[PDB]
Amino acid sequence: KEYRLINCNTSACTQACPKVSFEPIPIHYCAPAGFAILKCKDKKFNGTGPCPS
Amino acid sequence: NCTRPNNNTRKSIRIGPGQAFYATGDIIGDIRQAHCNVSKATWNETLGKVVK
Amino acid sequence: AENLWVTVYYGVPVWKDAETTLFCASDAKAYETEKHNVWATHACVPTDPNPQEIHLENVTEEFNMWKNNMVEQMHTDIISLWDQSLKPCVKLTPLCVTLQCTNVTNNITDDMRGELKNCSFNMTTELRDKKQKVYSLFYRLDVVQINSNKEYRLINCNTSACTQACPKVSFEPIPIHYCAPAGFAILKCKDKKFNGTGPCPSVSTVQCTHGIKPVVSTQLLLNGSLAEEEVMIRSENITNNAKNILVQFNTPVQINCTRPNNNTRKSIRIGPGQAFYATGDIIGDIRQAHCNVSKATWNETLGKVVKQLRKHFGNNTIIRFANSSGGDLEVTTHSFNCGGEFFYCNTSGLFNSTWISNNDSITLPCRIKQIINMWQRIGQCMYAPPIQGVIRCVSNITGLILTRDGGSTNSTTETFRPGGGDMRDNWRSELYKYKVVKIEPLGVAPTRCKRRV
Amino acid sequence: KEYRLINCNTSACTQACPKVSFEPIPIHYCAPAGFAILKCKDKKFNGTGPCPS
Amino acid sequence: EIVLTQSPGILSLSPGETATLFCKASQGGNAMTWYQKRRGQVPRLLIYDTSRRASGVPDRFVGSGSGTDFFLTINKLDREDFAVYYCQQFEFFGLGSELEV
Amino acid sequence: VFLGFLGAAGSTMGAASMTLTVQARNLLSGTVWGIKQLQARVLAVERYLRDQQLLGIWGCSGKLICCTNVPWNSSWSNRNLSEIWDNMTWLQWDKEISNYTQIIYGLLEESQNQQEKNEQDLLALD
Amino acid sequence: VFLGFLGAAGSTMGAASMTLTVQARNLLSGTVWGIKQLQARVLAVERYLRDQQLLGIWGCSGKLICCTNVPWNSSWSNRNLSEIWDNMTWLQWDKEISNYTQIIYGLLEESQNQQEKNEQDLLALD
Amino acid sequence: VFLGFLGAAGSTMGAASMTLTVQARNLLSGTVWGIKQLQARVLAVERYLRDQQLLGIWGCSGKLICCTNVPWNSSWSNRNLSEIWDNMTWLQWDKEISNYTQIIYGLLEESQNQQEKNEQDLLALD
Amino acid sequence: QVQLVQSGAVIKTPGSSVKISCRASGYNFRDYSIHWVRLIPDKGFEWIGWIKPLWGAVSYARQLQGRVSMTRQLSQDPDDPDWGVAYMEFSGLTPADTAEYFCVRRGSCDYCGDFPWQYWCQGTVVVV
Numbered sequence A, D: 001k002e003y004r005l006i007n008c009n010t011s012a013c014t015q016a017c018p019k020v021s022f023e024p025i026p027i028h029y030c031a032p033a034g035f036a037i038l039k040c041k042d043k044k045f046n047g048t049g050p051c052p053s
Numbered sequence B: 001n002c003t004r005p006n007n008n009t010r011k012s013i014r015i016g017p018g019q020a021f022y023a024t025g026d027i028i029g030d031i032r033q034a035h036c037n038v039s040k041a042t043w044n045e046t047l048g049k050v051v052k
Numbered sequence C: 001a002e003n004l005w006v007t008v009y010y011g012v013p014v015w016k017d018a019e020t021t022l023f024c025a026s027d028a029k030a031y032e033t034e035k036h037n038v039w040a041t042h043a044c045v046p047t048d049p050n051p052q053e054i055h056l057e058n059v060t061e062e063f064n065m066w067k068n069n070m071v072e073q074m075h076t077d078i079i080s081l082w083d084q085s086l087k088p089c090v091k092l093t094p095l096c097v098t099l100q101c102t103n104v105t106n107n108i109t110d111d112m113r114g115e116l117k118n119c120s121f122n123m124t125t126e127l128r129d130k131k132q133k134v135y136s137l138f139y140r141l142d143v144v145q146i147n148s149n150k151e152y153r154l155i156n157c158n159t160s161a162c163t164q165a166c167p168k169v170s171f172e173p174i175p176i177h178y179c180a181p182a183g184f185a186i187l188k189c190k191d192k193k194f195n196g197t198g199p200c201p202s203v204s205t206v207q208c209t210h211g212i213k214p215v216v217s218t219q220l221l222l223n224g225s226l227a228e229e230e231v232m233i234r235s236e237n238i239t240n241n242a243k244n245i246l247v248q249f250n251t252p253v254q255i256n257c258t259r260p261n262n263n264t265r266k267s268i269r270i271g272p273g274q275a276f277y278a279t280g281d282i283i284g285d286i287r288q289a290h291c292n293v294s295k296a297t298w299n300e301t302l303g304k305v306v307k308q309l310r311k312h313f314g315n316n317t318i319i320r321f322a323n324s325s326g327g328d329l330e331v332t333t334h335s336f337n338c339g340g341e342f343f344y345c346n347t348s349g350l351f352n353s354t355w356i357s358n359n360d361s362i363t364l365p366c367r368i369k370q371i372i373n374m375w376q377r378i379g380q381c382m383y384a385p386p387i388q389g390v391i392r393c394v395s396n397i398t399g400l401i402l403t404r405d406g407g408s409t410n411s412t413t414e415t416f417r418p419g420g421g422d423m424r425d426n427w428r429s430e431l432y433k434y435k436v437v438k439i440e441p442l443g444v445a446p447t448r449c450k451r452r453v
Numbered sequence E: 001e002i003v004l005t006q007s008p009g010i011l012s013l014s015p016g017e018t019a020t021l022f023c024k025a026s027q028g029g030n031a032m033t034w035y036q037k038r039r040g041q042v043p044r045l046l047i048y049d050t051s052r053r054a055s056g057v058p059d060r061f062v063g064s065g066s067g068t069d070f071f072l073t074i075n076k077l078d079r080e081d082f083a084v085y086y087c088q089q090f091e092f093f094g095l096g097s098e099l100e101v
Numbered sequence F, G, H: 001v002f003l004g005f006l007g008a009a010g011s012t013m014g015a016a017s018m019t020l021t022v023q024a025r026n027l028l029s030g031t032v033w034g035i036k037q038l039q040a041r042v043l044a045v046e047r048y049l050r051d052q053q054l055l056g057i058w059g060c061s062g063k064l065i066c067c068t069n070v071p072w073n074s075s076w077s078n079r080n081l082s083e084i085w086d087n088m089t090w091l092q093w094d095k096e097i098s099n100y101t102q103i104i105y106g107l108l109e110e111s112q113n114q115q116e117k118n119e120q121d122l123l124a125l126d
Numbered sequence I: 001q002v003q004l005v006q007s008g009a010v011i012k013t014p015g016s017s018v019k020i021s022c023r024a025s026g027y028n029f030r031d032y033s034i035h036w037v038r039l040i041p042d043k044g045f046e047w048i049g050w051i052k053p054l055w056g057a058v059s060y061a062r063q064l065q066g067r068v069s070m071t072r073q074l075s076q077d078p079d080d081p082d083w084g085v086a087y088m089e090f091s092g093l094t095p096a097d098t099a100e101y102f103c104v105r106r107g108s109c110d111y112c113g114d115f116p117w118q119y120w121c122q123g124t125v126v127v128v
Ligand SMILES: CC(=O)N[C@@H]1[C@@H](O)[C@H](O[C@@H]2O[C@H](CO)[C@@H](O[C@@H]3O[C@H](CO[C@H]4O[C@H](CO[C@H]5O[C@H](CO)[C@@H](O)[C@H](O)[C@@H]5O[C@H]5O[C@H](CO)[C@@H](O)[C@H](O)[C@@H]5O)[C@@H](O)[C@H](O)[C@@H]4O)[C@@H](O)[C@H](O[C@H]4O[C@H](CO)[C@@H](O)[C@H](O)[C@@H]4O)[C@@H]3O)[C@H](O)[C@H]2NC(C)=O)[C@@H](CO)O[C@H]1O
Pocket: B039, B040, B041, B042, B044
């Protein structure tokens, strides 16, 4: 009953360093100068169209 | 809430030199099944909200 | 008139202490070196034909060399620069193999151990299909007994991988200048009796530092710039034994070093493109690597450090010199490069003295390695190719990194021992004159003046 | 009658991705600001010397 | 060598009060370190560089001093503060002061 | 006389206010190493522009010395003229006024736009 | 009063022409991530200088509000003063004059050099 | 008439001193290739700022044509007005005065700060 | 989080040597010296020495020289390469050497010197 690692025919393989972490930590996307980010503060917005707040 | 109940163990295999594969060693204790729990109450409640 | 108004000033002479990325400067002769050898001399900007350092009269500045950045920056630049060089250079992955080694052809007295092991091994060929038994010569330190055959392995095989330095490169330390960006100054303590920490009366601004060549060496530091009057002994905390002592000489003590054996190099085709440089037959006698210093001058200069030391430990005190306590070969011995190979010289003969309150030379033996693990390496190592022929270098000793024994008991017999370990000490030794500041030209102050309507 | 790929003693070998193309497509060399490129529009110029046009 | 002399040997105070402990060094000019050792527990760094609090050390611990005279002040004493306190400079140590209830 | 860049460090704020065009001068013009060069080359123009930015949001694009309409709050210094221009040095002087430099700048910001909004009205009527 | 950067977005062009020094202020100062930082750091000074470039090839290095000698072509807007300064907002106003802003700029370019070539003649005779 | 960027190359220094705002215009706005773009993008602002640097340490932030207080040393050129403005071209003219341009600049540097240090005294008394 | 874990308590006969281990983890082992210190009943603390893990350079209290030897071993685990073990061997023991032995490490802040020990092993009791 002999087997193989499933990647062997599709792709190569590289062992993640245990000295690394997968925890999702919060990122902020900051703009350059003379660039703004505008924030829809409306608490009933469906994501498309005019935002009053 | 989610979990892997098995107290898994790791041994390190020297591919050498510098290279080293981390194998999965003996399973200490029972052999159980990975799973997740949510409240049936709250899921009921929140699935009611999406329907509304 | 009584009413004052603020008027702003642009170009005011004032600076805030800073940290920033500096950049390198070197000279035209460094590029004339060609041969694709020197590291980063090419990407490095040039120097100035007429350099100027403006003395700043009437100003004092609080220096601290033990809390500087441009030595941490430099230390880093040196490690990176070096590590980028080894990417193209060939990997000795398959050289990690069960060697079958003996001793080199010799008739020495039983006491004298064999330090040159003639090792034969199945090496790879240009073609995947085949193999090749081929022999090379290795130092005892570059191999370990693996286990009635006498079989060995390259010592790196369990700690790290290995990559052969390109012979088309050079290890010679060439002078680097650390130039500041615009609106950034470097301030230079021109006081000839400064211990590296505190207010400096004589100060000057300057764009770039002096030609600081990166001699990476333990125990005694070499070819560095030397003091102008006294043998200055500098430390962060002298009272605390845990901190080392940086001795900067006043006079150069010339130390001649050599590998007497006319070694030979053969090239082995790993293939394709890959090619290992083996160590071939030794032409002539089998002798011992060593260094010579004048016993006269060492006496003289060790007398100077004692005259200075008693200023810190009392006039009626014994100050003797002892050899290393124990540790890694990296630190238990004077390490350096010489002609392209790495040396490990026993300093027991130099630090073996005693000093009361009131014509040959010093032959000191050495060892030699090829697979080196400098800068506290962990995952990567480097094979320094055999340098064909006879090797000898001549250098001055500019300083020391000494260490005092903390047993104490208020005894007037506190002895010293040579140290090393952290290599920032070496750049700390040359960069003590310098400090980096952030220029802030926008002055605001009141003068009796209103702007028009 | 046995052979080898000719590179085996001179150099290593790397297979070009077929998902690439060798077709020479026209390139323009544009200058930075405050930099000009000067173009000899003389239709009898040998490449060296004063160009009137 | 440096000789550190702590006083008093024993200090007796109540929870809520402020304790002052002294350390006199035989040599002036060095900074002072303090440790707490509760009975049967691993020593814990409290103060270094004379006045800087170590990791997780609450602000009721206050180190100060100058020259040869150094002090640990413990404000609003908590039940846990009753312990032996040691001063240190480099490899040299005081013999400790016990704070008792 | 010509001392050099920063030469009037330990000179009086009057004598140092002579050599302003020398410090203002040596302030712009003058792959491992290659990256160092690039983030030093931008740092120098960023740092430089941030000062021109200020001079411009004030009225002092001249520049060097520029008078203004915000009066000196004695709380900031309160020292007499002589003892700062014919006495103190800018290294020294900077640390005194350091506590309110950004508050002082704010007084300047409003004052300039106030000038412009006014001067339009003059050219408007005339 | 102090609204904030862009605070006078939905304010009248008169009220928004007060807070100019606030939008002009927050406009300069404020290895994967390392490259992002660098081509954002240059983009900000490139974009900034391109405006100073214009103000300078006009006469308006002052700057903020700057009057000129090119008269308003009614074709561009034709609206009355009140209904743009005490009525419309700059977001709105921008889209009207947007069709000819670069043509308007050209009128400015020639007019400034024309001033200089003239003013030399004044200082020449006097 | 409008010739184009550098169009008045072989034009007289008088006629070329008309089209100044055109050469001044096309001077700013306009991973292998990616790096080329970046050290060209900084080079253009470095090179540009170094000129504004000079105009600013003189009095000529105007700019284009700017008169000054340093008189023309005949040793530099000594040619008559007509034969340089209505005769010679700037390509030509540049090579004559090239030997002393940096010495000339130095005369300008001191002269500007001298103006400022003086003008403060005027607003001081008045 | 830095962790120093020592080997267990031991009873030693006079004339013996004791070898104490200190497993250090949660930081780069090569970057910090380890000191050893002993707390002696009725006598207080006595600093024994330090070791710097890179080259294993050492310094021993003058009054203990000849009786103490410090060495270290660096992790050989490719996916966990930054911890290490410090060892101290103390020889020619007498009843006066009955003490609790600690391995200690400095804090890692900017103003932390070499001797203020922020991190302590749990101690090893040696009874001679
Ligand atoms: C199915 C699905 O996918 N949905 C899930 C869902 O299951 C779940 O939410 C649950 O749903 C189920 C079904 O819809 C609920 O079950 C029903 O619950 C009621 C239970 O009745 C309640 O109170 C009863 C007590 O009765 C009286 O007594 C009180 C205390 O003494 C008193 O205040 C009252 O007045 C009351 O009236 C009278 O009765 C008393 C005696 O009891 C008397 O003295 C008084 O004078 C009054 O006359 C008690 O019986 C019960 O425990 C509960 O508290 C039941 O009626 C339903 O039972 C019937 O149906 C069952 C199967 O459907 C069948 O087995 C029985 O035989 C009955 O016919 C039924 O159980 C449930 O409560 C609810 N569960 C939860 C956990 O909340 C949610 C949860 O995730 O998710 C959905 O997706």
